[PDB]
């Protein structure tokens, strides 16, 4: 009762990691719909509290929530007090549910809006270079422009299905 | 015991043996044939 590919159980006969069996894709496909519908049903009824959203702004990913501040090291050419929308959102999460973009969420699923509240120059930064025995010494001071944004609201819409 | 890098039997009675990490040549008939691997 031994197959041609049979090996008796030894230390190296089987891989050290236990065998893993993936679910049936046909059976799992409808199982995903049940989970998505349940999570979508949590949005229409508003069964969520504070939401944290990961947005891509100024070549940077910010883990922001509502009513918080973020400092941006460049000028947006926007008057202070103007309300704008952050189009790129990569992740929106709650206490019980989390949605992932691939790599970005649709504009019909999440909306993050911020406000320009302060535009100021950076504190003086010292840029000095020195080389010994070469009379090489020069000092430069730069003040990069900065912009502060406050996240006002993070709202989602029931568009999962 | 004479230390030799290469151990060679000097008669039919010499026999090689592995002891204490290095090969030895023992010869009861000729005690001067004893060698230790260097």
């Amino acid at each position: 009762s031994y197959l041609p590919g049979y090996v008796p159980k030894t230390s190296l006969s089987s891989p050290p990691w236990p065998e893993v069996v993936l679910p049936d894709p046909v059976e799992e496909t409808r199982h995903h719909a049940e989970v998505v519908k349940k999570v979508n049903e949590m949005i229409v009824t508003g069964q969520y509290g504070r939401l944290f959203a990961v947005v891509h702004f100024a070549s940077r990913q910010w883990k922001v929530t509502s009513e918080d501040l973020i400092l941006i090291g460049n000028e947006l050419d926007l008057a202070c007090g103007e309300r704008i929308r952050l189009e790129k959102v990569l992740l929106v999460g709650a206490d019980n549910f989390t949605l992932l973009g691939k790599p970005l969420l649709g504009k019909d699923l999440v909306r993050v809006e911020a406000t320009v509240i302060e535009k100021t120059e950076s504190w003086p930064r010292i840029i000095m270079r020195f080389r010994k025995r070469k009379n090489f010494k020069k000092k430069r001071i730069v003040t990069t422009p900065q912009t502060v944004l406050r996240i006002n609201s993070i709202e989602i819409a029931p568009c999962l299905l | 015991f004479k230390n030799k890098t290469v151990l060679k039997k000097r008669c039919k009675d010499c026999y090689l043996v592995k002891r204490r990490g290095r090969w030895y040549v023992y010869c009861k008939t000729h005690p001067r044939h004893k060698q230790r691997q260097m």
Partner: protein, 99 residues
């Protein structure tokens, strides 16, 4: 002079600190750092070390979901490596194409 040259070290040290924090949280879920970062790329989830380190500290439940996704994607690749392409690709192994 040290002030100017420390601006490169600060960027370097921040990323190294993030990797250790990401590695620490992955081991609590039975994963290694290469297994987490590598398998999140194949899911088109482009999250940098700064976010993952913050998620591993302030959003433990969200990080576990990412660990499960990376582990699931890791298992899908092994199953695809055993086959010769006859079986279809994994559910999470699909890639969204952009034109």
């Amino acid at each position: 002079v040290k002030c100017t040259k420390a601006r490169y070290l600060k960027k370097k040290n921040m990323r190294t600190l993030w990797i250790n924090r990401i590695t620490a949280a992955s081991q609590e879920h039975g994963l290694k750092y290469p297994a987490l970062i590598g398998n999140l790329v194949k899911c088109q989830v482009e999250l940098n070390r700064k976010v993952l380190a913050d998620l591993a500290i302030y959003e433990p439940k969200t990080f576990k979901s990412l660990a499960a996704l990376a582990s699931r994607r890791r298992h899908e690749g092994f199953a695809a490596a055993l086959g010769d392409g006859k079986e279809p690709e994994g559910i999470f192994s699909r890639v969204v194409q952009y034109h």
